[PDB]
Design a protein around this ligand. Structure first.
Ligand SMILES: Nc1nc2c(ncn2[C@@H]2O[C@H](COP(=O)(O)OP(=O)(O)OP(=O)(O)O)[C@@H](O)[C@H]2O)c(=O)[nH]1
Ligand SMILES: Nc1nc2c(ncn2[C@@H]2O[C@H](COP(=O)(O)OP(=O)(O)OP(=O)(O)O)[C@@H](O)[C@H]2O)c(=O)[nH]1
Ligand SMILES: Nc1nc2c(ncn2[C@@H]2O[C@H](COP(=O)(O)OP(=O)(O)OP(=O)(O)O)[C@@H](O)[C@H]2O)c(=O)[nH]1
Ligand SMILES: Nc1ncnc2c1ncn2[C@@H]1O[C@H](COP(=O)(O)OP(=O)(O)OP(=O)(O)O)[C@@H](O)[C@H]1O
Ligand SMILES: Nc1ncnc2c1ncn2[C@@H]1O[C@H](COP(=O)(O)OP(=O)(O)OP(=O)(O)O)[C@@H](O)[C@H]1O
Ligand SMILES: Nc1ncnc2c1ncn2[C@@H]1O[C@H](COP(=O)(O)OP(=O)(O)OP(=O)(O)O)[C@@H](O)[C@H]1O
Ligand SMILES: [Mg+2]
Ligand SMILES: [Mg+2]
Ligand SMILES: [Mg+2]
Ligand SMILES: [Mg+2]
Ligand SMILES: [Mg+2]
Ligand SMILES: [Mg+2]
Lengths: 464, 464, 464, 108
């Protein structure tokens, strides 16, 4: 009658939890070449990534630069919310304006502007050339950085420096092939697009074609703009933040909390799905059980993020005594979510690319990275040089002494983070590991990799 | 209804994998003396070894020297394939020419050849004496290194130095006992063999008898030549390589891949078995499951090599998340292979002789060694002396400064490998361990050892 | 002809520098008992301390709290200047107001005031009771915290709560003995002081007598107020800062630079001595040679602070290659300063009380401590409790998640400094060491300790 | 700074520049870090362990980044020394004096 581990209740100890180190993928019959494997996967019910990876909504991981780089690499970034609403919406706008098929709201100047003014506008938006318009709205010319590079007098009006009309232009609805033929024939980089009355309504640049050729895996919407996500909390300020982000053009909203099996989080997810569901996907926060994942599915979530204290000696486990090993949590959440076609995002506890392969084999569709991306060039923080090495730091007015020791050392030298280099190299290594796993298991797609089998190993199998 | 480790599929976690540290051999009723134990075992279905050990096809382990030493010790070597086809075939020929019951293609010279010419021939074939024939093709004498030793003029022709005919010779078909009798009567080391017309058709030396008596366990063919194996890959270049290696007289081909559960590998095995299966044994590459071994058996393999990420922190486990604990993999492969009489080769994860005993008890017929043999004298690499110790290294023109620091230290100092000394001592240690295991389990032969029982131990059993 | 260390110039290597670890104090004939030794010493030419110690002008060492504690312990504190002029002057005002023989400008209230107003004033100035005047300035009562403790309506006016006139008062010029007798007789803690016409001009508390009894070594001026110093730089901002500090009641100004052998520093010292020298002492910043100290003495400094890269592996030595071993630097500076009666302050490189004794024996009058005081209770920073221990930290709005890991650990967990406890215990240990040194050397006074001899020790004397 | 003060006119650097971006070698990414290495045909196996690691993983030098940052740090140190010794030029720095320190002066 007694349970062998104590007491009379057999459900007191509900189950045995497996982490990544407990299992390995078994080799299987394979006709799959790792170079030819297909790593595309569903992020949500409506969004498919070329690379099944997403950067974490942490203030040391994802801002505009990280989101742009992740989207170009074939994945996506989720902007963190440890900042005011206006700045987060500005970062969303920055990501969405990085590239496009046609700039539908080009930054224009006036002929009465000075060279300093247009220079400052360009630096504000990180652009090189502006069309110029009059006090009515007729296009009177275009000014580019080759014009200002060869004009010294910064007080000259744009009308003196600009290239005056008529300009090489095209009308609305010009195909990309025709617009590119025009850009090539006239040996220019920019092309205004005007309506039937000559009013400027768009801009096509050759740099967008170059970027499209250079980043063929880019995660883009129908208009050719990079996809991006953003995190929100729960509450009324969270609702205002979410509405502002939706106005800024966000594609994915993540209701991002530590414990999503809570009525408030479910109500927030349902409200967001009702209000802006037809435009934006809503992802529901971190769960670790079948019941919580089912509750999020019931609430209308377009994806389910898994992981609650997944690290071995993480703070949740030590301080609160709460956790769930990640393999078992993913298996339970997938058992809840797969019948309804809802993807599962594995969040937390990944140290190596083998862990990514295991997490996807357990049933997840994507993986959230986090600390693997903390010290890359695209992550927030400043680059410093200390003791012959590079580091990333998260760093005076009254220290006017020129010979003081604080002048002899860089700022931020305390608690610096090791520098990792460009994001692309890290992503490429992770994808090489995943492709090796797919080749070993004979999985041509991620959906086939989700059917792979494990072997459970003893502690002796971890001894070096 | 839920599986205790998560989800609803009871086969998602297929099994629990045991490694070598997970088990121990149980003592049993024994009348077996370790010295009288019989360690012979089947390498393939047609080849039986005196010592059940084979050296890995790694470029830091097995070349001609290692293959010769392994065959003499009672095992065999498998030549690595990380080199041009011509060099691998030359290494096969070097192994096959080391010793024989009768040299069937003696290196002959001509009376017109200078001493430097025949000396160069001796250095090329690493021999000591050459018969001499004229331009017609008739044997006119023999020149040995004793004749060349007492000569001060290096420009002399062979006709002025050679021992002239008639020689101490014999006809075709003369038995070894009679040839040894003749070599004993006339106190000479070499004996030419002529046909019914006095045409040279063989050469019997006494060094062959010395070698036979000195290495009584040598793995040899019907002609008294050492056995050797070689590895090939998959593809057209692999097919050309395999044909060239067969022409050089190789005895075993190993189709050597990381993942043999693959249609290309199975096709290669079938093609090789059709083309050269009457002469050469074909061994199929690394598997780790029962179905893979069954596929190799059905493809016609003469032996099956087992092991896919068998080490604890191996790169395959870390990077791809793929592996299989070796004891369980051997048990599954033997379950597939034993009914058809196909021997199983255990390849990887072996650290001590006790592991060799465990692997053979799990059902394997031989073990492939690898890193245990890497630092030995016969292994490839150069011996250097650094900091009072010996090392093996895998190592100028424009550094002509006589007093430079690079002159003060040996080439190859960085990334060096510890020196282990002669291979015979290492093999003797391993065989002593195996014989002790056989004594403890009461196994008079390897086939009886394959029936021995295990005890599974806990983590407390691995704490020093 | 050549110098033994190379070259032809015997002054190229000017001297051999001794540090604290190179020397020990020799025992001498002694009738001194450590408990009866006199540790008083000159800080400047006009200020004498009971304990020859001063806290450093570092933003992790000295603010108002540390300055008060150091003055009460018998030494003095120098406020750091890494903060706006107004805040530094406010800290000077806080230190000066902490205790006095008589509050010459008491914080008065009006009968119309609410209890919130007087409570805000009390919490602002950290006091207990306020006299009251009418809109003309006539004394009509006093309100203390025992009155407000028993009033529950927070919104009441003062006239309802104040003890009405006539109060227990005394006239200007009242002796401290008379005021103590009055307070003792009438069983009260506060005593207004009025002129002949009854206008309020002072307040005497019994807490001042209690503090005078509790801290008998306190460093005070003629008014019974604690002494305090403050650091200034060089420049026009520095001049305005110095003038503001002199207004606030500073007692010592310390021109605080890394390298004082500079024309601007000397001119700043001269200007300060011309302007405010009749009231305030001016101390000249850090020097390391005899010539620099002589320059500071010529410029008019009241004390000379010594030390330029005195630590062994300090940043100045590693980065600039510049430094001076502290014992030799003190000997040279004393050689410059002693003929003119200018005290020397030893600043930096002190690790133990033995080092303090050595610095005073080399000829310094006081020591500046710094890192020894950094983690004490009175130093700036917030006390936190991490992992069963106490630490001091120099450490959200948008992070509203109640269960996130950040809520589980204290803020400032990174870069925390060990908690040292109360400052008095540290000072007591250091003074005990110094008194033991005086007993060993037979020094009844610090001036006698300055005549003690050293023995130089070799490397073997530092090997544990 | 010490070498110039002893009378040298320039300094030759060497190991301080071996790991920089402009130095010879190949940039590789190992275990979450960047390294420089001074590094196949017959290894056609697509799933072998050699395909899972970068070539040249052994004998690698750490990566230091741009050369300009290293030169700027060194020049900042030199300028601080020139400020301490009152040397407006390198020729004046060559006239600066030394103090000899003992073994205790190098003891942490
Ligand atoms: N000029 C311009 N570019 C914009 C604007 N908004 C977004 N962009 C994007 O900015 C990117 C760079 O544009 P420019 O700075 O004009 O570059 P370019 O001169 O066309 O090209 P390169 O000389 O090859 O750099 C393009 O991919 C545009 O899609 C805008 O208002 N003006
Ligand atoms: N001379 C010779 N030896 C060959 C040839 N092919 C193989 N061998 C072997 O080479 C080995 C060495 O033979 P030799 O070099 O002639 O040695 P030896 O002078 O007879 O003997 P020792 O003086 O005792 O070393 C023998 O075991 C031969 O079987 C060949 O073409 N010529
Ligand atoms: N009340 C008062 N104290 C001042 C003022 N300026 C400085 N102090 C000092 O503040 C210290 C504390 O005064 P109170 O808080 O009134 O102390 P108390 O109520 O007399 O004494 P305890 O009840 O024993 O704490 C004394 O040492 C005063 O000298 C001032 O304007 N008003
Ligand atoms: N649509 C257009 N029609 C005609 N001329 C144009 C047009 N757009 C730009 N120009 C002119 O062509 C020249 C080159 O401008 P473009 O924008 O192609 O290069 P840029 O970005 O200034 O140069 P670079 O990329 O080399 O720094 C300028 O003189 C500019 O005024
Ligand atoms: N069959 C033979 N008939 C006649 N003379 C022979 C014959 N074989 C060898 N000799 C001669 O006998 C001598 C001894 O040669 P042998 O081959 O026995 O030894 P070796 O290998 O030259 O010498 P060692 O091994 O002692 O250095 C030589 O002069 C050789 O020419
Ligand atoms: N000079 C004075 N003359 C008359 N009454 C006074 C005088 N000073 C204070 N009182 C009154 O005497 C009472 C005692 O107050 P007192 O200032 O002595 O102590 P307190 O600081 O309020 O108390 P505690 O130290 O216990 O917190 C109060 O009601 C106060 O208003
Ligand atoms: Mg441009
Ligand atoms: Mg361009
Ligand atoms: Mg011989
Ligand atoms: Mg011989
Ligand atoms: Mg009180
Ligand atoms: Mg009281």
């Amino acid at each position: 009658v007694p349970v062998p581990t104590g007491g009379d209740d057999p459900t007191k100890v509900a189950m045995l939890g497996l982490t990544f180190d407990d299992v390995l993928l078994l080799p299987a019959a394979s006709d799959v070449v790792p170079a030819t494997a297909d790593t595309s996967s569903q992020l949500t019910k409506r969004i498919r990534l070329r690379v099944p990876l997403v950067s974490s909504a942490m203030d040391t991981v994802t801002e505009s630069r990280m989101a742009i780089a992740m989207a170009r690499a074939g994945g996506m970034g989720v902007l963190h919310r440890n900042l005011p609403v206006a700045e987060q919406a500005g970062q969303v706008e920055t990501v969405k304006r990085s590239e496009a098929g046609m700039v539908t709201d080009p930054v224009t100047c006036s002929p009465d502007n000075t060279l300093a003014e247009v220079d400052a506008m360009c630096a504000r938006f990180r652009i090189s050339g502006l069309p110029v318009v009059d006090d009515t709205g007729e296009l009177v010319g275009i000014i580019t950085n080759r014009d200002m590079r060869f004009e010294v007098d910064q007080s000259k009006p744009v009308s003196e420096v600009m290239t005056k009309a008529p300009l090489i232009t095209a009308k609305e609805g010009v195909s990309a092939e025709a617009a590119l033929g025009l850009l090539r024939r006239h040996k220019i980089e920019k092309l205004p697009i005007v309506d039937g009355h000559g009013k400027l309504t768009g801009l096509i640049t050759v740099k967008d074609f170059v970027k499209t050729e250079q980043f063929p895996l880019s995660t883009k919407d129908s208009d050719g703009r990079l996809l991006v996500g953003a995190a929100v909390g729960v509450g009324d300020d969270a609702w205002t933040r979410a509405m502002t982000l939706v106005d800024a053009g966000v594609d994915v909203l993540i209701v991002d909390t530590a414990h999503a099996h809570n009525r408030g989080v479910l109500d927030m997810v349902s409200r967001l799905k009702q209000a802006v569901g037809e435009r934006v996907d809503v992802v529901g926060g971190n769960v670790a059980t079948r019941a919580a994942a089912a509750a999020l599915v019931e609430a209308g979530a377009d994806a389910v993020k898994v992981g609650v204290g997944p690290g071995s000696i993480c703070t949740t486990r030590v301080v609160a005594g709460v956790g769930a090993p990640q393999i078992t949590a993913i298996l339970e959440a997938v058992a809840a979510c797969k019948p309804y076609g809802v993807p599962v995002i594995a969040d937390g506890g990944l140290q190596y690319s083998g862990d990514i392969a295991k997490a996807l084999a357990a049933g997840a569709s994507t993986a959230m990275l986090g600390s693997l991306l903390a010290g890359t060039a695209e992550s927030p923080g400043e680059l410093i040089f200390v003791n012959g090495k590079q580091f990333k730091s998260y760093r005076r007015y009254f220290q006017d002494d020129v010979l003081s020791e604080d002048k002899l050392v860089p700022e931020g030298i305390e608690g610096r983070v090791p520098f990792r280099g460009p994001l692309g190299t890290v992503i490429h290594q992770l994808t090489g590991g995943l492709r090796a796993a797919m080749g070993y298991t004979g999985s041509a797609t991620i959906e086939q990799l989700q059917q792979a089998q494990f072997v459970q190993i003893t502690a002796a199998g971890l001894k070096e």
